[PDB]
Amino acid sequence: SMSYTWTGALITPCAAEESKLPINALSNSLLRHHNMVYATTSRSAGLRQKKVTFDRLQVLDDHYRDVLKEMKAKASTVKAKLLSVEEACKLTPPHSAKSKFGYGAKDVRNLSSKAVNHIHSVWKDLLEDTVTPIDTTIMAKNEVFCVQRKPARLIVFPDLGVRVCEKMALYDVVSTLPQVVMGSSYGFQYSPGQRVEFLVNTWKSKKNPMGFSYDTRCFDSTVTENDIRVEESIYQCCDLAPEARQAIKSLTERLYIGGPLTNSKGQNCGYRRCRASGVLTTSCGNTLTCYLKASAACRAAKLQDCTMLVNGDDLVVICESAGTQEDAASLRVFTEAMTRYSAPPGDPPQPEYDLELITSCSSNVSVAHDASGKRVYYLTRDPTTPLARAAWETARHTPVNSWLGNIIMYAPTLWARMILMTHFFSILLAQEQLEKALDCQIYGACYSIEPLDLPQIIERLHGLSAFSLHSYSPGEINRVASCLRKLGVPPLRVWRHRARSVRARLLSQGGRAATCGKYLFNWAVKTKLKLTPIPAASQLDLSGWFVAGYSGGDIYHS
Ligand SMILES: O=C(O)[C@H](Cc1ccccc1)N(Cc1ccc(-c2cc3ccccc3o2)s1)C(=O)c1ccc(Cl)cc1Cl
């Protein structure tokens, strides 16, 4: 079956679309090569439509069914609950697309009778109708990138009322099942640090460790009706209220498997027979399907001690190496086996015998030293993307403050400390918006965060070491350095000279700011400071921050 069928109608833009980095008075204090940064618009949607329209073909051997059985067993221990409507509402993102039925996210969160009535009636349609396809909207995504240009990705999502419904039936499922079914291998249960510790222990649990990541060529399009249905047999293994089983069956037949795509102007763009990105089960399902296809594939290729870490469509496999010549052979089979499951490779996975050489979730493990000179591991990455965006957001406020999200998730990184924290705090001082809560996204979910809190938040996601790390490896430093030369970002020495000033600015502010300049820039000075636990750091409520991803699921918290 073809992943997609087009009618020829264009995927139209809902609003104005900028493709060129806006420039303001602050711009050059960060990135001088403006011709390097751009944003994807609905103008390239046609390209993307071409790269993802293809026919999927699957050959499921016993190794495939073997693993699927194991998973269903563990799945059978899960007892998901049926969210009521109010609860559902209370999980909808304050800035989530409004309903084509007269009410919006603001309406739903508050439980206005308009939204609650409609949802109650949408849910009923799911219980007495298990076939009529549910309409969807297809818009091109606007993401910023560096050149050397990729076509805009495609977002497909059902109406707000249906989204609320998905939660009532699946919210509790997608949060639980993954951990239970895949155990430690489930990547959305780890904070950046725990992810790093998991990969290290796992690397140490091998006499001869050998690893590789596996990138699927546009994974959503590879996903076939069979996958969507198998996913369901898995969900249906849970102890689920009867009404929920129906809704999950109904959502499956009428939505997740496929359905008509409607552009922003109401025209028909075509039909979908693969994964919809805007559904509650997108992240969970992918991860589920990706884990199943890569476990079978492991056995198919006789890989010794197959351990895996799976975050949605991203895959990492650390096993017991059996000889450099023997591994490259194994991986060939593995790729071939994945290809038979409709999970071909975008790039040939290649074996690495060096941990800090594998890239999962666009990141990697690297090393430095804490306050005690002890070797400590942290999660870092190429800063190209993060900065390019931090730049765009320097002259354009976005719904997703990437620079903040980035700082929270990469506090320990050489580039996030010297550049991101400095640059942006400097700007918060001038505007005096040091406490204005701002949105940002982590593993998918949108959180509201106040800048002055960062000190506590960071300590809570990485620990005190995120303020005293030093002697970063030469490999990392050189990468941060190069990327800067590329985008035209001033050298690191310049930033330290600026952080020295921003530190001083924050310190003078006393209070929570004084804490910020105290802990966030304590690396800019020579006479280091004490830095001890933060009293209100143990106050923060971070249980639900990293229990499950919701990328393309309509999720929000505090
Ligand atoms: O230890 C390191 O890896 C870097 C190495 C490094 C090298 C080049 C550019 C940036 C970082 N470094 C070591 C140094 C800190 C200050 C240095 C220095 C020497 C010097 C001489 C004259 C004028 C200013 C100067 O700053 S070297 C740091 O103290 C440091 C640690 C964490 C963070 Cl977030 C930032 C820094 Cl600066």
Curated annotation (Swiss-Prot):
Subcellular location: Host cytoplasm; Host endoplasmic reticulum membrane
Subunit structure as annotated in this protein's UniProt entry: Homooligomer. Interacts with non-structural protein 5A. Interacts with host VAPB. Interacts with host PRK2/PKN2. Interacts with host HNRNPA1 and SEPT6; these interactions facilitate the viral replication. Part of the replication complex composed of NS2, NS3, NS4A, NS4B, NS5A and the RNA-directed RNA polymerase embedded in an ER-derived membranous web.
Catalytic reaction(s) noted: RNA(n) + a ribonucleoside 5'-triphosphate = RNA(n+1) + diphosphate
Manner of cofactor binding, per the entry note: Binds 2 magnesium ion that constitute a dinuclear catalytic metal center.
Reported regulation of activity: Activity is up-regulated by PRK2/PKN2-mediated phosphorylation.
Bilayer topology annotation: Single-pass type IV membrane protein
Domain RdRp catalytic: 209-327
Modified residues (Phosphoserine): 29, 42
Cofactor dependence: Mg(2+)
Effect after changing residue 215 to C/G/N: Complete loss of RdRp activity
Species, as recorded: Hepatitis C virus genotype 1b (isolate BK) (HCV)
Function: RNA-dependent RNA polymerase that performs primer-template recognition and RNA synthesis during viral replication. Initiates RNA transcription/replication at a flavin adenine dinucleotide (FAD), resulting in a 5'- FAD cap on viral RNAs. In this way, recognition of viral 5' RNA by host pattern recognition receptors can be bypassed, thereby evading activation of antiviral pathways.
Superkingdom assignment: Viruses
Name of the featured protein: RNA-directed RNA polymerase
Full-protein interval shown: 2420 to 2982 of 3010
Binding-site residues for Mg(2+) 2, renumbered to this chain: 215, 313-314
Post-translational modification summary for this protein: The N-terminus is phosphorylated by host PRK2/PKN2.
UniProt-reported outcome of changing residue 278 to D/L/R: Complete loss of RdRp activity
